[PDB]
Amino acid sequence: PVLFPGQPFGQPPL
Amino acid sequence: PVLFPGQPFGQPPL
Amino acid sequence: PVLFPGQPFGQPPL
Amino acid sequence: PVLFPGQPFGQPPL
Amino acid sequence: PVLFPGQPFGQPPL
Amino acid sequence: PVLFPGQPFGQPPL
Amino acid sequence: PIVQNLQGQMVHQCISPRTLNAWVKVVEEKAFSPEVIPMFSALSCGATPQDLNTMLNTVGGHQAAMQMLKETINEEAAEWDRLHPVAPGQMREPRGSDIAGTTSTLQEQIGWMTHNPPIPVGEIYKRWIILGLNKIVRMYSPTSILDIRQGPKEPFRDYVDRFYKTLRAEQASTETLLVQNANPDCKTILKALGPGATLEEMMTACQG
Amino acid sequence: PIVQNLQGQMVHQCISPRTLNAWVKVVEEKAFSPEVIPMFSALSCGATPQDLNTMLNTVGGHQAAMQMLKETINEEAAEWDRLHPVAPGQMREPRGSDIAGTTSTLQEQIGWMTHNPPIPVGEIYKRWIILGLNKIVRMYSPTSILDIRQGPKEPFRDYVDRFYKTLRAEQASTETLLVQNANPDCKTILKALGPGATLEEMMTACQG
Amino acid sequence: PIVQNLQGQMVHQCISPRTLNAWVKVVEEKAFSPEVIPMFSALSCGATPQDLNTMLNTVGGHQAAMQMLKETINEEAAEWDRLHPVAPGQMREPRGSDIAGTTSTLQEQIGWMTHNPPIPVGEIYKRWIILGLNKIVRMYSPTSILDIRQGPKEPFRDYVDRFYKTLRAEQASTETLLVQNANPDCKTILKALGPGATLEEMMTACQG
Amino acid sequence: PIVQNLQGQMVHQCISPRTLNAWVKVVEEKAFSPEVIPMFSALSCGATPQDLNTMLNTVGGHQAAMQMLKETINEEAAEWDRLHPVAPGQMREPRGSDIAGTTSTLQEQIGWMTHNPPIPVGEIYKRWIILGLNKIVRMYSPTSILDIRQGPKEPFRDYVDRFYKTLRAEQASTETLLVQNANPDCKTILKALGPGATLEEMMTACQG
Amino acid sequence: PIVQNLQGQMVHQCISPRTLNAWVKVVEEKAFSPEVIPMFSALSCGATPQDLNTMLNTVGGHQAAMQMLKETINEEAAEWDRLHPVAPGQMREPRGSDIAGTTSTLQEQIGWMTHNPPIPVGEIYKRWIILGLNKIVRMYSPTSILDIRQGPKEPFRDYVDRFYKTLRAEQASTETLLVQNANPDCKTILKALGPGATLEEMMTACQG
Amino acid sequence: PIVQNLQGQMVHQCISPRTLNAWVKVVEEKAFSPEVIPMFSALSCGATPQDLNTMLNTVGGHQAAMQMLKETINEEAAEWDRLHPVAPGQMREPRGSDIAGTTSTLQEQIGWMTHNPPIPVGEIYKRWIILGLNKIVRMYSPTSILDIRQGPKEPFRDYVDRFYKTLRAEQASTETLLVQNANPDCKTILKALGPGATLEEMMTACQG
Ligand SMILES: [Cl-]
Ligand SMILES: [Cl-]
Ligand SMILES: [Cl-]
Ligand SMILES: [Cl-]
Ligand SMILES: [Cl-]
Ligand SMILES: [Cl-]
């Protein structure tokens, strides 16, 4: 996914 | 007249 | 018609 | 005088 | 002094 | 440290 | 909207938060009193069809009125298509749906509005909208001018206010009736003053 | 309005939401107190006839006053047409109806206002409007200066405030009367002070 | 956002405090009424993905909705990557995560948005967001159109308002039903009026 | 006002709705407390005589003060005419009435203010107005410094606040008196501290 | 902040009163709810270290948090100095204290930020601040996700709101638990729906 | 203030109504809490001595503080004259009184501030003012750090807030004391945690 539960919009992954 | 009763300011005539 | 009931103003058709 | 009682500030005379 | 009691800030002297 | 307790953010040291 | 800049060219600008909020608040407070229409017109100065649709869509509730407005726009759009029966990189001609912003993009709207000569689709659509808003004002006008009569102790000034407030709403889409609907005491005074009297002279006469 | 830009040229600008709201709010709060007129004038700085009509139309209620205003504008427009008896792509001469913005478009108004030499139709129309507003202020002035008398225990300062507030409203469209309408105790003091006293000196004298 | 300047070039601007506060306040007051979506769209005019994420993140509470929104964005991003299978100092192609602003920097977003031809990642992401917001509106719509029936003494106008308010929310993601759900007295009148009547004509008929 | 633009030239600007409202509100809330004068001066930065008259005229009530202000302006204007005894398309010399904006047009005011060298009629008139406002502050000052005495249980800080608030108003148009008007307990402490003490040292000493 | 102008050059601008007030008000109202951080980031767009320190210093109270923030900044500054071991009229290299704005002047900050290539000390410092703010959010998070359980009569939507509000705060610095913490009736429905269900599908299922 | 324009030149601008009102309101609401000083500094960005005097003069009440401020300015001005012992159309050197804006005109202030190299009289005067404001904060600080002790049932977080709020005010012009002033139960926990613990670790430890 691009976004995960409880993480902000725009949150970088990895 | 230019303006008539019950008609808006700037109302075009005719 | 251009606009239909319950659809927003500017709603694209088709 | 320049200004008179009961007349606005900037009121032209005569 | 530059400023005196009861006189505004920026008040010219003399 | 850069900042110390009870001193403003940006407070110059020394 | 589309406005001028330092270079003297017509450029698109985002509708401002002040404008958006002002329109929402005037509808909330005033509903469809006549004075809401000139406010709409003023707030939508230089508006694209997109901007006009934005303003209309931001309205919560009042959906009976908004549906009547849709009908009016449909009628005006149909008439446009009747009167205006409609190449790579060239400007097409706007249909009714393009003017109302359903089938036209923002860039197409800007193209038409800033062309030489300009095709003012924003102004055309606003005309249709204002036409519809006037019908709604008329529909929601609560009182006939025939039922505005001066009370036995109502000051003449207050009566005249009610009279011309009612007339404004009723005519959205006189001198003799004003006198006839006045109470006995002022009617007597107004009769003695005679016809040809200005409103100011009438109000002065019944003031005491 | 019409204002200057970076190029130093006179360009049209949309009437702002701040301006629109300020005028609506001053009428709502102050009705037709004298101070509403200079506020109208200031808020309509650089205004086109269209802008002036927008401001007037955004007013809900007060329709007796608005009808009197129409009469005044009709009178001033008639006089203009009497004094000014009026080609492809050329500027026509503005009639009364054009100045009042009924028969002129926004672009024609801008043409006249930004011409060299300029034909300031915005300023001419504002003059007629301000003339009408002053008559309304006079009409709605509740008290004659003759009935402003200092109370037995009313502080002189409060009396002088009432005196000059009343005078302002009554004259919209002295020194001796101020003394005559003063109460016995201050009148005695003001008589002893004698004529030629400034208002400041009078107020100082009756302060204690 | 990205907007034009005096030089006619597209330059980045900081999201303003007015814009930030307006969005926070509309969510607080209106939650997820349909009219919140066009307000979001208008307030985010010219927005970068970063700006869109800023607006979404400033929202306190409503986290069930925000989680549903994440799901929708994940779905739209997955579809983008399926349809668009993706050098020193050269512009790379945006993936779904870049459009949603997780893996792209502000400068990369500006690069794509101001390129010739432009890759409007701000508009693409807004499309996904608006898609998600519409689903939330539908989810939180409290009433079916089938349960909007005119009360025995409810004015027809008030009923029509409820009818079209409900329809708007329910359809986020008629003429005959309006008549069928009307009360006995208005239904009789509307039947006599017959089919083909406009909403205005129907409302006029049941007004008395 | 008159302000600079991108070209570095002095151009006229309309008085803003923010400025107009701020002045109206400060007078309403603060009447003629001393701090109203520097606010007037700041709000009227770059003001023409027309702008100054606009601000003064927007004031409702306080007409005793406004009449005193007229007197002061008349006096200052008379003195100007005494000290300055006054061709096609050429700049005339401003008389007192021109500076006060009764006999000068806005364009004449702009001509004088933007000339090289400039004739700052806006600043001259503001000087007369501020002179008059200071007299009004003095007139409406309720308390003599002689009657500001520290209460038996009044904290010294609160007394010093009253002392210097009163002094400011009274002097509109010390160290030893502060000590003399202090209560017995602080006076004893201040006597022991001796002369030459700063206000800070005095306040520290009587703090406990 | 530092922003672009008409010439396309990066120039310093004063932090605006709107920005200053917005930050003060969001802290007052929201304290350290997660949504305060993206608001801080947005309000400090283009900020110099000086601007960031201004915003932090304008905060009254919350001094436990502000002291924790100081600690975090000290840690990040120490790490910078470890990783970056540091001529007339030449640009020196910024140390940790320079980035935090204790030992750097505003002009030095502008020099670094507008250099080519730019040394974005404003963005670096904001990163440290946001790191610290996230720890504070985590510290002040009142509830563990383990204690968010659906009430016997609590609507599922309200439970999901609490669940994801708590998760957001707790993670500042799932699908199965949501089901496990649901009440018996919805848990039964969610079990029957099975794994792989979207949040939307889950909420629809337990809605009735 | 003095700010940049499109031409990249430093030009004078009028102090805005927003700025004027913001300063008046922060003093009214916050009096002399420490956070008022950075707000003053931020609101007076680019300020001339005239602007600084305007802001100081718009303050009603608080005249004990304003008199202390005068003393401080007198001291700093005297020191300037000691350290700086001071032709047609040439720039003179600023004395203390010129920096404080008593003996310098606005144009002289602009001349010094925009000169090359610039003589920043606005910044120098602000330094003196901020020095004085800090002394006032210290004077009006109500509590010694020695009297901030954790209550028997007061949450540790609330105690730490009081501790560092007090410390900020007291130092205007630690780790071990925090522990010593803690209540028995948290002191025991903090002793066991040992020295070298961060504030975050301490707060976590006494949280339960
Ligand atoms: Cl709705
Ligand atoms: Cl009306
Ligand atoms: Cl939340
Ligand atoms: Cl008055
Ligand atoms: Cl604090
Ligand atoms: Cl005071």
Numbering used by the authors:
A (entry chain B), B (entry chain B), C (entry chain B), D (entry chain B), E (entry chain B), F (entry chain B): 313 to 326
G (entry chain A), H (entry chain A), I (entry chain A), J (entry chain A), K (entry chain A), L (entry chain A): 1 to 86, 92 to 178, 186 to 220
Provide the authors' original text about this structure.
Here we report crystal structures of assembled HIV-1 CA hexamers with peptides comprising the linear binding epitopes of NUP153 and CPSF6 and the two antiviral compounds PF74 and BI-2. To attempt to explain how these diverse phenotypes are achieved, we carried out interaction studies using a CA that can be assembled into stable hexamers through the formation of engineered disulfide bonds at the NTD-NTD intrahexameric interface. The structures reveal that the binding pocket identified for CPSF6 in CA NTD is actually part of a much larger protein-protein interface that also accommodates NUP153 and is present only in assembled CA. The complete binding site is formed by NTD helices 3 and 4 of one CA monomer (referred to as the ‘first site’) and NTD helices 2 and 7 and CTD helices 8 and 9 from an adjacent monomer (referred to as the ‘second site’).
To understand how CPSF6 and NUP153 interact with hexameric CA we determined X-ray crystal structures with the same peptide ligands used in the ITC studies. Crystals of each complex were obtained in two different spacegroups, hexagonal (P6) and orthorhombic (P212121), similar to those reported for the uncomplexed CA hexamer. Within one monomer, CPSF6 interacts with N53, L56, N57, M66, Q67, L69, K70, I73, N74, A77, S102, A105, G106, T107, T108 and Y130. Previously, we have shown that CPSF6 residue F321, which occupies the same pocket as the phenyl rings of PF74 and BI-2, is critical for interaction of CPSF6 with capsid. We confirmed that CPSF6 F321 is critical for hexamer binding, as mutation to alanine abolishes interaction. Within the monomer binding site, NUP153 makes unique contacts with Q63, while CPSF6 makes unique contacts with N74, A77, S102 and T108. The unique interaction of CPSF6 with N74 explains why mutation N74D prevents binding to CPSF6 but allows co-immunoprecipitation with NUP153 and remains sensitive to TRIM-NUP153 restriction. Outside of the phenylalanine binding pocket, the two ligands form distinct interactions with hexameric capsid. Both cofactors make interactions across neighbouring hexamers but while CPSF6 contacts the CTD of the second monomer, NUP153 interacts predominantly with the NTD. The ligands diverge after the shared phenylalanine, with CPSF6 residues 315–319 intercalating between helices 4 and 9 in neighbouring monomers and making contacts with residues Y169, L172, R173, Q179, K182, N183 and T186, including hydrogen bonds with Q179 and K182. However, mutants F316A and P317A both have significantly reduced binding affinity for hexamer as measured by ITC, while the introduction of charged residues by either P317D or G318R abolishes binding completely.
